[PDB]
Write a protein that binds this ligand. Structure first.
Ligand SMILES: [Mn+2]
Ligand SMILES: [Mn+2]
Lengths: 128, 128
């Protein structure tokens, strides 16, 4: 689910940032009460994404994938000229509704612009 | 809301297709129970999107924009080479989570590829 992915992402990011994931930090990162974190952490444990709390290899794999996908979509929206202020909220929504196929094709397109700057200028010219 | 956008879009599409929007057709289009439809219909009436379901001018403007947005994003995923079978499901989800700014820039991106087929060919080459 979207929520589960939001949690796994924030947990992975805290562990990379701090070395551990506190319930209070997850709650602060997701703007939720810790009782919701506690209840969700018990599901993630049940579904073997985690064992403070430690991500299993399964949990680590998904976390890293979600971070990559967020970063990819940010650079996609940035490349096509979306106002920087708007990018995060858009990515945070759309990330959960894109198939791997779309993600990978968005990947190729990001690569398409990056390998020749003229392409970027031509895209900019249309926006005029 | 996302749900409200789904309903307004489907109502607009039925009126364009058939000339009218019956609650039973709405229910089938969204695969929901009629009571869910009637609840949203009253909400849309209260919010002056509609009044024998008839869109007010406010309702038509939004309906037309939502149909446009859907088509645009289908075209976007299609151009970048997403498997046709996967496109509709992805668009159905992301359409609610993109700012107008993102939609406009995606519009520019679609225009970018549509105006020179060589650009499409160059993108497909990268995909190899
Ligand atoms: Mn998110
Ligand atoms: Mn939808």
């Amino acid at each position: 689910t979207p929520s589960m992915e939001d949690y796994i992402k924030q947990i992975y990011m805290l562990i990379e940032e701090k070395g551990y994931a506190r319930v209070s930090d997850i709650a602060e990162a997701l703007a939720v009460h810790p009782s919701s974190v506690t209840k969700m952490v018990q599901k993630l444990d049940k579904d073997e994404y985690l064992i403070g709390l430690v991500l299993t290899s399964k949990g680590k794999k998904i976390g890293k994938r979600l971070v990559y996908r967020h970063e990819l979509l940010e650079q996609f929206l940035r490349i096509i000229g979306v106002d920087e202020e708007k990018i995060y909220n858009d990515v945070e929504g759309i990330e959960h509704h894109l198939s791997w196929n779309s993600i990978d094709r968005i990947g190729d397109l990001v690569q398409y612009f990056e390998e020749d700057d003229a392409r970027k200028k031509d895209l900019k010219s249309i926006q005029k």
